[PDB]
Design a protein around this ligand. Structure first.
Ligand SMILES: [Mg+2]
Ligand SMILES: [Mg+2]
Ligand SMILES: [Mg+2]
Ligand SMILES: [Mg+2]
Ligand SMILES: [Mg+2]
Ligand SMILES: [Mg+2]
Ligand SMILES: [Mg+2]
Ligand SMILES: [Mg+2]
Ligand SMILES: [Mg+2]
Ligand SMILES: [Mg+2]
Ligand SMILES: [Mg+2]
Ligand SMILES: [Mg+2]
Ligand SMILES: [Mg+2]
Ligand SMILES: [Mg+2]
Ligand SMILES: [Mg+2]
Ligand SMILES: [Mg+2]
Ligand SMILES: [Mg+2]
Ligand SMILES: [Mg+2]
Ligand SMILES: [Mg+2]
Ligand SMILES: [Mg+2]
Ligand SMILES: [Mg+2]
Ligand SMILES: [Mg+2]
Ligand SMILES: [Mg+2]
Ligand SMILES: [Mg+2]
Ligand SMILES: [Mg+2]
Ligand SMILES: [Mg+2]
Lengths: 175, 72, 122
RNA sequence: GUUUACCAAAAACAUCACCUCUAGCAUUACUAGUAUUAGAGGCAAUGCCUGCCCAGUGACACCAGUUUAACGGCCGCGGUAUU
RNA sequence: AGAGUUAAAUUAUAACUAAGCUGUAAAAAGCCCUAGUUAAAAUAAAAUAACCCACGAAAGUGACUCUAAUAAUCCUGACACACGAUAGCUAGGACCCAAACUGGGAUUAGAUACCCCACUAUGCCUAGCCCUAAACCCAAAUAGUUACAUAACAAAACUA
């Protein structure tokens, strides 16, 4: 988790001249201290697009969108951590996540280098969609578990029979 | 007008619900027998699986849980 | 101006009122507030009798406190003002001077709706 | 798990669970505790349930009235669908 | 979605005063620990504005305040994922008022109804289930056209 410091002097007021010469009070009213949450979000967005990107000027690029969306997503994550039962934002969260993952699937198919970079930088891990979405239910889960166990046992026993065969034929051939 | 169809369905459903109320514990017994049958067939399936794989006993530490007979 | 504290105080003499206003303002600056102004709307008879702190009140003094505060703290201030026995009733509002007036360009008249029904000849 | 040591070991008892009642509190029990506690009992884990009755008898309410997961109760005779 | 708040009622509860009060097309039963006025927490519900047509994907949402907040540089898309009115279920808390059930009173040939009174599950809060509605604006989603042209009725006809 990052920390956009309480004194950080919100985004629109950073580039106006002679700001630091102003007295403590006005400097404090323009601080992230007296700010909204949306201000901290503007700041976080800027900082991230500068850290991660190449050309922070293009909003139109796939990667730029992926960054913005990632900021939004993290914010919803926070909101959902405070409000458990809010269904509206659980929808927003999951939905938005899917959008991001779609744009990712798109980057990975067009520009691979940048995709790789972004995945590393944002901590996003891209997984391939399985073929065959099916609901795993009690019967299938249990039966599959058994079948895997039966498999491991069978090949383990084949290995033991081969160790016995090797030992026997070797001790025979020697004398 | 179209209500005639709706009236038919209305009556059918009503009748049927009444029926389930009367026949309730018979139905109960039957569903329970069916769940037993289900659990058994599931067991047979698994047993057939490890046996056609050549093994004699079920693999080490296999209890074959009761999924259907699960307490309601 | 950011927040507007509407304060309705128990109707009292000069020193006690000045006292309450003082400790209230202090309490505000303690939660991290910057107080822009203090206004006095005078004392009136209340719109209706307000029961607070085991007292039924008829009259009261009215005050506005415009201030800047971190979003977090409003709840805190509210709590404080709730347990003050000299406050008849607190309220905290986004300051009316933050919202700016868009221009009514006029009333665009609405024509009677048409083609609601078909051209059928009854 | 318990029981008739010396004719009965059990389907009896207890029991987790579920339920009723009774208590607002201090230096020997309960308890150096305080109603999510402590006593008096019923019934027997779990699951689906636990229907109707306060007239009698109790017990609360010192009389009215309330109580059945308190003691306990929970019906007939005649005539009818060709039979 | 959170947290905080309460104007109008209403009620526990007293204080006076009155013998009745309630209830219907009409009565009975009920209540007189009742009624009118003067005081009043909690609970629940949110006149007027609204002749408005906003927000939300839908279900839904119209007392006040604040915090957080309404995906996608926007084609379609599941049996996958997340929701989903009322009722209902489990556990704890609330209870003004309403009210399936049930018990009284009428009605009636009967009346296990409509009408009257009383009271419960339930409606409320917390947490978890349940996953259905005439969930219908009975009109799929996205882009368009007003050309050809009336089965009937209804919300006019059509293209991809
Ligand atoms: Mg039929
Ligand atoms: Mg013996
Ligand atoms: Mg012995
Ligand atoms: Mg024995
Ligand atoms: Mg013996
Ligand atoms: Mg026994
Ligand atoms: Mg039980
Ligand atoms: Mg039992
Ligand atoms: Mg019984
Ligand atoms: Mg009795
Ligand atoms: Mg009696
Ligand atoms: Mg809540
Ligand atoms: Mg009460
Ligand atoms: Mg009478
Ligand atoms: Mg209102
Ligand atoms: Mg959107
Ligand atoms: Mg789509
Ligand atoms: Mg639902
Ligand atoms: Mg409950
Ligand atoms: Mg009730
Ligand atoms: Mg009623
Ligand atoms: Mg009756
Ligand atoms: Mg409910
Ligand atoms: Mg609807
Ligand atoms: Mg349909
Ligand atoms: Mg569709």
């Amino acid at each position: 988790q990052d920390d956009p410091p309480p004194s950080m002097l919100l985004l629109d007021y950073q580039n106006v001249p002679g700001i630091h010469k102003v007295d403590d009070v006005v400097k404090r009213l323009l601080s992230l201290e007296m700010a909204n949450q949306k201000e901290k979000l503007k700041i976080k967005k800027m900082q991230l697009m500068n850290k991660v990107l190449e050309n922070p000027e293009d909003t139109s690029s796939l990667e730029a969108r992926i960054v913005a969306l990632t900021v939004k997503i993290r914010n919803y994550e926070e909101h959902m951590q405070k409000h458990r039962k809010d269904k509206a934002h659980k929808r927003f969260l999951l939905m938005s996540i899917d959008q991001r993952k779609k744009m990712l699937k798109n980057l990975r198919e067009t520009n691979y280098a940048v995709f790789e970079k972004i995945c590393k930088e944002l901590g996003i891990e891209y997984t391939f969609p399985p073929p065959y979405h099916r609901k795993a239910h009690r019967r299938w889960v249990t039966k599959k578990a058994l079948c895997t166990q039966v498999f491991r046992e069978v090949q383990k026993l084949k290995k033991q029979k081969r160790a016995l065969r090797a030992a026997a034929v070797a001790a025979h051939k020697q004398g | 007008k179209n209500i005639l169809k709706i009236r038919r369905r209305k009556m059918n459903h009503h009748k049927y619900r009444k029926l389930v109320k009367r026949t309730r514990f018979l139905r109960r017994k039957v569903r329970e027998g069916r769940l037993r049958q289900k659990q058994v067939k599931f067991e047979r399936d698994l047993k057939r699986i490890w046996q056609k794989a050549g093994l004699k006993e079920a693999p080490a530490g296999w209890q074959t849980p009761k999924i259907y007979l699960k307490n309601q | 101006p950011r927040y507007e504290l509407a304060l309705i105080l128990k109707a009292m003499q000069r020193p006690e009122t000045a006292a309450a206003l003082k400790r209230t303002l202090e309490a505000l600056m303690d939660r991290g507030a910057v107080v822009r102004n203090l206004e006095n709307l005078g004392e009136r008879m209340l719109p209706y009798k307000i029961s607070a702190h085991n007292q039924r009140h008829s009259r009261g003094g009215y005050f506005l406190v415009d201030f800047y505060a971190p979003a977090t703290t409003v709840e805190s201030m509210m709590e404080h003002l709730s347990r003050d026995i000299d406050v008849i009733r607190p309220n905290i509002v986004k300051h009316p001077l933050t919202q700016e007036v868009k221009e009514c360009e006029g009333i665009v008249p609405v024509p009677l709706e048409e083609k609601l029904y078909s051209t059928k000849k009854r």
